[PDB]
């Protein structure tokens, strides 16, 4: 009973990282409804705070078990549990900033356990990340496809800026089950991540995400599966 995916699941997360050489750690806890595609988390900076950069570059690194999938697509990442999966991401921002991430996901004692390692580099001094001028992510579409025995996703991800401008990243992620799992074909995932509350210096932050997979081929019949 401590090794299955219930309709309500909690998670714990630890992140160690650096951005432009500034080392930090985060610990958090979350919860959500994996088959509905919804989740929330509360994150706390436990080393290196206050962070001298925008929280928003970290927020997408805190949970793909909580994606609502069509009934006729193998839910590769759910299927990988309890052992779980690993993911690796590269984000290329339009001003030369780069974020690379690796992550381990497992199911232990009835909760998901996430361990994240992050390296952000080359953010410019007069850009919005190092000056905390961002204001959350627009909804995204992640184009998923199998490749080389893993599941890949690509996103053109748009960060809102306080001045009404926008700031784009190109993102690629590899998601790989720890044991062999049947891979899906290509499909898309619609995602929206919100920061629902935070303290003044973003050392305590609450997030919400909704994510839903959809077929990208198959005509009307493959809609709303």
């Amino acid at each position: 009973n401590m090794a299955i995916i219930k309709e309500f699941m909690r998670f714990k997360v630890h992140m160690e990282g650096s951005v432009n050489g500034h080392e930090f750690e985060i610990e958090g806890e979350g919860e959500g409804r994996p088959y509905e595609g919804t989740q929330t988390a509360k994150l706390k900076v436990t080393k290196g705070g206050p962070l001298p950069f925008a929280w928003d570059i970290l927020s997408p690194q805190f949970s793909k078990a909580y994606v609502k999938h069509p009934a006729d697509i193998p839910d590769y990442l759910k299927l990988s549990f309890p052992e779980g999966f690993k993911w690796e991401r590269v984000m290329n921002f339009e001003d030369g900033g780069v974020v690379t991430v690796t992550q381990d996901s497992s199911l232990q004692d009835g909760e998901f356990i996430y361990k994240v390692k992050l390296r952000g580099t080359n953010f410019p001094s007069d850009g919005p990340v190092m000056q905390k001028k961002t204001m959350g992510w627009e909804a995204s579409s992640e184009r998923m496809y199998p490749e080389d025995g893993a599941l890949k996703g690509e996103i053109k991800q748009r960060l809102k800026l306080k001045d009404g401008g926008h700031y784009d990243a190109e993102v690629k992620t590899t998601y790989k089950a720890k044991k062999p799992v049947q891979l899906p074909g290509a499909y898309n995932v619609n995602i929206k991540l919100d920061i629902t509350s935070h303290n003044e210096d973003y050392t305590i932050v609450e997030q919400y995400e909704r994510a839903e997979g959809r077929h990208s081929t198959g005509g009307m019949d493959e809609l709303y599966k």
Partner: nanobody
């Protein structure tokens, strides 16, 4: 696609035992987690696609056992200590999301049912 074919329903005596089967076929049979529901629908027990996790409704725990032959994508529900009120049509259903709990709406593929009578 996943197709499910059940077998094994029979008449047994009170206190008796039976073994039901459900064979999954189709492109996603290897990824099919299978759950049994009975309709006199109510959850009975389920087993993950890998055969490695099982979950039993309260009334089934300790007297029923589920197993999976991964080479045939077939599951077996061994029912012991059966009583008249276990009489029902037993359905097996499947999902591709590693779900083995009681919400029937999370199983999108259904077998045809098999009749168990205890009397």
């Amino acid at each position: 696609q996943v197709q499910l074919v059940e077998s094994g329903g029979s008449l047994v005596q009170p206190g008796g035992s039976l073994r039901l089967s459900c064979a999954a076929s189709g492109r996603f049979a290897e990824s099919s987690s299978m759950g049994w529901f009975r309709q006199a629908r109510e959850f009975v027990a389920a087993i993950s696609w890998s055969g490695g996790a099982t979950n039993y409704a309260d009334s089934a725990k300790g007297r029923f056992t589920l197993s999976r032959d991964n080479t045939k994508n077939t599951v077996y529900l061994q029912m012991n200590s059966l009583k008249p009120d276990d009489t029902a049509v037993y359905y097996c259903a499947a999902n591709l999301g590693n779900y083995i709990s009681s919400n029937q709406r999370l199983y999108g593929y259904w077998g045809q049912g098999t009749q168990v009578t205890v009397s």
